[PDB]
Design a protein around this nucleic acid. Structure first.
Length: 437
RNA sequence: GGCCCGGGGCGGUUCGAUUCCGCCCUGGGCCAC
């Protein structure tokens, strides 16, 4: 029931069993043949190549090596041809550049094209840095693969594994660098506890120093931060998870948390107990990829949150959720209703010039003096958050992200009350309000 | 697509805007890569 005892049973969840392992080898096997039969220069990389892949995440990455002189276009065309010829089923995919994804003997395969080079410089695209990352890692990580898996399993179970924008967590490469640095998962966890937002980990120099931000310097490129897209709050959650784990080790830290859905009735009661304004902006989800969508949801969410705060509705927290169908921007405010009149600060009494201009405005209530300066009562255009966001979203749709904003412009509604509790957002709402149990 | 930084125009808002809320062009860096 102590750390060691737990990490033992935890392996069971992160390490792939013989059947899954065999499936991958027989696949790498066949994949090899097909490529040699065309005599292509390739190099398996990624977690499959180093046996650092998490149980259930089997996927083979194959990078095709091309001469430095070949053209951008050449690589994609030939990469496509090759990928086409070797994959049972395929499907052009995209990221920095287009690439081929498919399945061989029942397993996911990625066929990426890149430039065969030597020495980190000369690099043209992040895909070229992958072989170097791989080289630096194969020798150093050998023998610690299960330590890598515990860390990945740990981060994954707590919703902070991937480095894509939907997650903003720890990339797999980062996890392997951490193991190489600390030696094991427990050592990584024990030290992470003393991590700060100013911590800088330098694998190449085997050093830990203070910086302006959390920086895990790439062994292959001292200027690149591997934890660049790890978010401040996600770094905080990890640090806090590590402290709690070392305090009360549990297998539970490696098991995915249950959705724990709730009945809209209890949710309705909670919001009533809160006395707050809970509402959502619902619009149609743009047909774009997560990497473009979620950063936009954050912006749209932030822009409106700041509108709510400068408009005095005392926002608490925000959230958002995407579906195949729609997107929801969720909000909770302390002010369900603010008055019509508010006070605008005017000039100091001595400034005759500005005072006259300030008093020249025809207002409904007659301005007054208070502690040396003039003030005026003014009337608002809206008195409820919902009412405010309807105005805001309607005229500032263009500042809520290029795609999200264009979608909001053509359609969006504001839901609240029971009507909201029926939408697919209860999970996000409970998280947002700290509903426990 | 998003984030950081820096320019040239603008609009609305305000007693007063470089500085609030936004929009055009526009140069550089970063991120998912």
């Amino acid at each position: 029931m102590k750390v060691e005892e737990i990490l033992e049973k935890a392996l069971e969840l992160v390490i792939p069993d013989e059947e899954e392992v065999r499936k991958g080898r027989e696949a790498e096997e066949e994949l090899r043949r097909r490529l040699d039969e065309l005599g292509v220069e390739y190099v398996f990389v990624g977690s499959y190549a180093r046996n650092t892949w998490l149980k259930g995440s089997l996927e083979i990455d194959v990078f095709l090596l091309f001469p430095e002189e070949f053209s951008k276009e050449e690589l994609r065309e030939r990469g496509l041809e090759i990928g086409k010829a070797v994959l049972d089923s395929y499907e052009i995919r995209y990221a920095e550049h287009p690439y081929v994804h498919g399945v061989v003997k029942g397993v996911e395969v990625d066929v990426v094209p890149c430039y065969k080079l030597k020495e980190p410089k000369n690099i043209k695209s992040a895909v070229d840095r992958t072989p170097f990352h791989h080289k630096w890692l194969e020798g150093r990580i050998k023998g610690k693969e299960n330590e890598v898996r515990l860390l990945k399993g740990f981060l994954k179970a707590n919703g902070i594994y991937g480095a894509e924008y939907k997650v903003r967590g720890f990339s797999g490469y980062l996890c392997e660098l951490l193991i190489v640095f600390y030696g094991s998962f427990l050592e990584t966890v024990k030290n992470a506890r003393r991590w700060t937002r100013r911590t800088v980990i330098d694998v190449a120099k085997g050093e830990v120093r203070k910086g302006e931000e959390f920086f895990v310097v790439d062994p292959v490129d001292e200027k690149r931060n591997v934890a660049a897209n790890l978010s401040l709050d996600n770094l905080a959650r990890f640090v806090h998870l590590c402290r709690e784990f070392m305090e009360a080790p549990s297998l539970g830290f490696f098991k995915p948390k249950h959705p724990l859905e709730i009945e809209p009735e209890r949710l309705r009661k909670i919001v009533e107990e809160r006395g707050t304004a809970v509402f959502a902006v619902k619009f149609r989800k743009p047909d774009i990829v997560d990497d473009n969508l979620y950063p936009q949801l954050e912006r749209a969410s932030r822009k409106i949150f700041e509108f709510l705060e400068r408009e005095n509705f005392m926002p608490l927290r925000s959230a958002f959720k995407a579906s195949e169908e729609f997107c929801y921007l969720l909000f909770e405010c302390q002010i369900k209703e603010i008055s019509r009149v508010f006070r605008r600060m005017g000039p100091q009494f001595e400034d005759e010039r500005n005072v006259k201009k300030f008093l020249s405005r025809n207002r409904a209530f007659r301005p007054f003096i208070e502690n040396g300066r003039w003030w005026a009562f003014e009337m608002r255009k809206f008195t409820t958050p919902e009412e405010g966001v309807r105005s805001y979203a309607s005229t500032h749709w263009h500042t809520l992200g290029k795609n999200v904003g264009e979608s909001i412009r053509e359609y969006f509604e504001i839901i609240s009350g029971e009507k909201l509790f029926k939408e697919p957002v209860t999970a996000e709402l409970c998280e947002m309000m700290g509903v426990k149990d």
